[PDB]
């Protein structure tokens, strides 16, 4: 019964999940889940605290974890020691909070909303048609999930998809975790002893599925240094 | 005489070359494979010995040298220090053996024939149809061919395309190599005294003409942990 | 004013900056450059000084600054401490030359001319046709422009695009940058006080702009190890 | 000028330096000041903020900075995501404050002195006697100095040696430094511009008058594993 | 009870750890020792498979792990994919085994033998006088204990600290250590549900009190190559 | 007649040393024997072209290969892209050029004269006396030897060992090695097929015979940035 495909998955990164645990039975954070996702995502994937800036001068607000293409991302601004991350090159932002609350639900929706307001530039690629924007991913990351009843919190999860605040996926570490799903169109919440390996599997399914890094328009940042003329 | 192009391409990772030269002197070599692999393949490759597992919970026999896609794997597990590789990660299979004979063969497309028995899926793409499963490439890797005539290592590896278990690749260090032309519709043997880095390079090419890793399903493995509802 | 979008491009890997500035007043090279590069390009490029080689068994002379596929390269040769890279590889060369003028402009056309001389391969994909080669960015990188006039510059800059000599791309360290533009179908000259940092934003607009890699034809090169049969 | 041994000195690590007074200004810092001393530091030596334990059972509290033995320490906890370092393996520990005022010092007294009182052990060598406790150096970095005249500093930092509170440096970035001299058995006060690097040298000459790490008691943490029999 | 020293103990890389108790689950290991021995062990020792070598051109059997000084080590040997370390580099050697019984103990004890029957070489120090030769740590790693009885093992563990093949350290893990103790001047067996860690530190224990490498005669492996004249 | 501790040794960093006589062939430099020395030197050495600087703002000139301790180093200098480095660090310095002859030699001795009349310091120990400073080894590397009489170089080669610009070791690579030593008290020439690597095993002896790098005085840098009062 080792040598069991249900083992091997429980087993996989066993060592971080269980400093998650550890956390959460303390509690009874934030570097802990930014541990995590680096090690569960493939390569061309990165997790951290970060601001998001868009050639616009705008900035979000700190976004506790920011998952970004390092790999074919073309800068990444270091202002002290603070990360910048430019909004072209970010798959998800999630919200950090020890509890998982309509309160802390709403805090979440606001973060995501914020980094999904920024501008984002596509171009054209040699000639097709510039690609459509990635979707986003938004959440929320907690330790303890304080809306027992599935109704309670399916209730303040409903929201609609045309809203920039609308999350995706979430976890209450080894307790539940949810997602939308297209199909079914609804939210989905599932409560599952090892709901932090299957949280994570879902957001590998999402990001598999959130489309290819769309082309920067480099000028666009570099118009913060020199004219142009048309 | 040394700079031409000749000497480079025989002078490419020299060192890891000689280590398996020595090897086929000692003998008159699993590990001098692994380790020639990981020096002449790009960085997307990796080679290892290790076991391959499907999403239903399916696993081939130890593989001597498996060559899988590092870059954009979403998982690799390891049992003690035994590395589990999911079957639609790999891209080649080989066993390894001190000496090419027809016992060998048979005992390189059994290892083959397990590999590509197992079930590997593939998702359509933002929307596309589902990529063509890569064919996976089988081969045997030996120190030295005890079938000398040509006629008679040709015989033993005539094999039907259709057939799980043949044999695009395959070695004698320092001494033959063959493969399958699809242009000829044939195996090819070809003795020569830099045979190694002329199998190399059979190998770079066969293996630029795979084809993308397939979209895969990350829920036909995420099944093994929470149920769906269709 | 820290935070910025201004501040944040002039700060990016400010310390390489600064290295190059120094050096522009010790002389009021080399190495400044190949170190600025690899800072400031992404994972997938590497920059060198290198020999360029393709598959006819020719070399280019000495390239002082060589942009390359470090990722999805099949293979690199070094003779002795030299590295020797295939023509299918490479983005972008250059000249380096204390100063900006006519003879240095010539000097570094008859480089850029020389690797683009080369025979690069490239091959179908399935089956797609086979992919237009690369467009080969040529410049010069310099510390002290020696053509104050706009127009003494402009002048010795104008070369037609179907030349193999003619130069993309070039800098004045801290003084000015130019650059030929499609939609414009002229080269452009522009004198900033941040000219280093215009001049590599501009660099990585036209590497995106390249295309992608052409599939090489691993054969051309191991032709030189072993005869083929038609 | 450039090649003079002040400007080399001035130039060293520039660019964490530089962090450092943007961070000074923009309060007009944790993290730069753990950036800034890995830098600085030989190998032998490695900062980060932390815990401190030892083989009571006792703990310090967070340390803004302590500076450790990576290189000859036999053990280094992690709970979670937090650092835990045996006492014996400890030469330094510092405070962060924004300011530097007679509280912000009674807080590093403090901090210094939990540190301090922790038990250390040191066995004897083959026999020689067991090796003299290192003297722990203790600490107070900040942004801004709010004590402006030299007297009002010198008083509030005027402790006696026997004390385990007592601070042997200290600094206000791009603005002052302080340390105690046994030749002159008193504290000394420099206000200079570039007083952030003559701190690390100053800190550099501190560490190396320490002595070397005593042999720890395995057996005294092994103890909270297995019986002892005398 | 979480930030209990001896929690911090146990935890202390925990993830090598819960490798090995599968192994010996699954039984009911070669690799798994070397791994856990190199997280354990502090930078100046690595862990290995190798051969041992003499300047005397006298060879050990393959140690199943040995455990060296790689800092201060001028040279290490690389036959094939085999490592071939010289004997002045060797603080410890240990036979591997599934099970810990007489006839095990035996073949640990010819192992160990074969390594200390070595010539080691020892210069003076500027002039002091050569360093006493180290004294080599043997020992056997075990995952199931086939001697329940403590009086079973202790009288197949009773040797003579003259005999070359006594063993100072073993363990089944998760079950018992054995260790030999010169105040106590015998062997002692200590039967705990956290054996391993519990070995670890007696093995780093015995490595502290081991002494520091003699200063290898280089020569001695020199006269290999070129003659001397006296 | 592989397992051969003299067939170990000429196989020791074999690529490496491969390089060097293809240089040697071409010639019928510099960044071999850098290569070189890095791979056969342990950790505790770093070899590098540098300029030599010390705390009297003396800087030598640009040395081909320094070999200077990287562990123990507070700090080493970086102009633009040149290495400066502590006099105090510095235990080896080699000129190199193509051919050993008369000339050569002398411009050698002279090199190794500038980095010796640098001032060093050395301060006493906790109180034990400052430790004797380092005897700095000064070579010659070249790739073909000119006096071939063993008489026409043994007397160009015979200097005073208070004379600054003596040497102490140097090689013509696959030719001959030559060294002073002192139970003889005088040069020794040495002609050998695999002077290489018996070139190097004496490099490795005459360093361990150093010394231990003494106590930089810092304070004698960090005066170029503070005052201090006696």
Not at 3 to 10: A, K, N, P, Y
Not at 13 to 28: C, E, G, I, N, P
Not at 136 to 145: H, K, M, R
Request: charged content about 25%.
């Amino acid at each position: 019964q080792d040598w069991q495909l249900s083992e091997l998955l429980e087993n996989l990164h066993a060592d971080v999940q269980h400093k998650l645990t550890t956390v959460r039975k303390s509690f009874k954070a934030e570097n802990v889940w930014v541990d995590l996702f680096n090690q569960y995502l493939p390569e061309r994937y990165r997790a951290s605290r970060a601001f998001v800036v868009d050639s616009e001068n705008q900035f979000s607000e700190q976004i506790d974890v920011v998952i970004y293409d390092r790999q074919y991302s073309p800068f990444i601004f270091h202002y002290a020691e603070q990360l910048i991350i430019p909004a072209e090159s970010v798959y998800a932002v999630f919200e950090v909070k020890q509890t998982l609350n309509k309160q802390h639900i709403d805090a979440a929706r606001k973060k995501v909303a914020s980094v999904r307001a920024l501008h984002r530039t596509s171009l054209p690629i040699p000639v097709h048609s510039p690609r459509e924007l990635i979707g986003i991913i938004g959440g929320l990351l907690t330790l303890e999930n304080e809306l027992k009843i599935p109704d309670t919190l399916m209730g303040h999860l409903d929201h609609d998809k045309a809203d920039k605040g609308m999350l995706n996926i979430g976890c209450a570490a080894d307790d539940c975790f949810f997602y939308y799903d297209n199909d079914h169109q609804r939210m989905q919440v599932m409560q599952h002893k090892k709901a932090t390996t299957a949280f994570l599997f879902e957001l590998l399914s999402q990001l598999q599925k959130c489309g290819t890094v769309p082309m920067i328009d480099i000028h666009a940042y570099g118009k913060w240094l020199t004219p142009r003329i048309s």
